[PDB]
């Protein structure tokens, strides 16, 4: 029966690749002739191409999802390796650049909140005026 199931599965796969619209494997004679002739035109009018498109799009989503899972998972393991190497001082040349980039990234971010050099000029000038009156220091 695995003989049977394996037999069906292989031929079913071939059918989809070659004849997508055809169903898978699982009276008066004149009427039979007429039916087959009718089956010809409707099969000829079948829209196979969109069927081939649908199976592709279904498969592509699964492959894409798994690829993202692999992409996400290795980064976590990659970042773990950076932790242990850094704590033990086993940093390679590559790892010493990735963190150095992070220094630039974070330091670059903090620059926006550090404000401009032009503003601190008058802020400092205004800053001193208000101290000297509240702090006094003439006496």
């Amino acid at each position: 029966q695995t003989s049977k199931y394996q037999a069906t599965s292989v031929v079913n796969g071939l059918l989809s690749n070659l004849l997508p619209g055809v169903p898978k494997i699982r009276g008066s004679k004149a009427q039979l002739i007429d039916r087959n002739l009718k089956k010809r035109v409707q099969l000829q009018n079948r829209d196979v191409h969109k069927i081939k498109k649908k199976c592709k799009l279904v498969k592509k989503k699964k492959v894409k999802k798994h690829k993202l899972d692999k992409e996400q998972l290795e980064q976590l393991a990659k970042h773990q390796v950076l932790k242990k190497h850094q704590h033990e001082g086993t940093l390679t040349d590559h790892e010493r650049k990735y963190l150095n980039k992070l220094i630039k990234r974070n330091s670059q971010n903090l620059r926006s909140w550090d404000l401009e050099e032009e503003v601190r000029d008058e802020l400092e000038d205004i800053q001193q005026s208000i101290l000297k009156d509240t702090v006094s220091t003439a006496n």
Binding site: T2, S3, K4, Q6, A7, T8, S9, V10, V11, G13, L14, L15, N17, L18, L19, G21, V22, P23, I25, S28, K29, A30, L32, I33, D34, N36, L37, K39, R40, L43, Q44, K62, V63, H66, K67, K70, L73, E74, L76, A77, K78, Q80, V81, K84, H85, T90, T92
Partner: protein
Amino acid sequence: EFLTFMNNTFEFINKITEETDVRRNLRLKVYSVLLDETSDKKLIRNIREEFGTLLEGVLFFINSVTTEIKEILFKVLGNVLQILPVDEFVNAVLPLLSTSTNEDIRYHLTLVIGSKFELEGSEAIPIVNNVMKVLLDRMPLESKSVVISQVILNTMTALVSKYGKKLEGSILTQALTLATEKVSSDMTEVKISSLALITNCVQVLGVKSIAFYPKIVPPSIKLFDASLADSSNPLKEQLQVAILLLFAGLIKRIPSFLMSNILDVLHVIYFSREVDSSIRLSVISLIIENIDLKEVLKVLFRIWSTEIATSNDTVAVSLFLSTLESTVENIDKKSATSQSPIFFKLLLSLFEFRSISSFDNNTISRIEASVHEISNSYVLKMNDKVFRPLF
């Protein structure tokens, strides 16, 4: 008692191995070792060797199992399969196939290998090349076991279908040579797997498979004749579909080379009783838009006089009519005129079908109606000069 405890025993390995934090996940720890360059290589081979025993151990329980305990084992196996990547999976599993002495276990290991490639991409092309060299070498060894023999061929079929073109050519040709030899295998399973592999291999190779053409089609036609004789075969329907699908694939890939042997192809389609009419009628169309029509019309006369006329089979006659009507509605102006004498010669025989036909009046009348419309279609679409002698 023991079973209840044994049922509990497999809840643990499920619970521990279940992928419910970098530290907790057994899966994630494995990659960190692999990604860590400083990790000893002798440490890595321990992971590969240790996993193989674990995978073999769980399969042994599955092979030798109880429904609920059976269910848990797959939960355990699924966790086990995802512990390590495809790169290490193949290296830690392919050696075990020869090492494994149990036919059931070997039957299991083949399935899991295919499942890993079901969702892989072009990154596994070097991996897949390694696997084929192993699977090809195991085929002569595993020829005794049909189930193992069938599965290995099936796995090769799925993966030659998937990015088979990118695989190194030497493996492809070797696979084709392997498949053709196994076509003659007495067991029906090996044939259908053999035919299936030939379809994809011929599909990828295309014209490069012409060297094997004498080893593909003439055996298949002989196989079909044997297929009719052994009507007690439980896989007769599957076997016949395999023969038809074999032709359908190569009708798309190598039309020109098949025109000479096109006659026997139609003989297969018309007299393949078990296969569904939709399957047959589909492959009738492919012949029309892939093979030169002029050759077909020449053959339609010979096959009609030889077999279909005396066949007395409703399906065969209807299929023949579907071919003839499809050809005439597609045949060109120039080709129709040149082939006119043969068509009219066939037309006279069709008119005389009533004399020999064993069917009732209604069928013959309906058949004659189809003959007249195609004749009207065929006599139209020509000029006066060609028709005047024929008239």
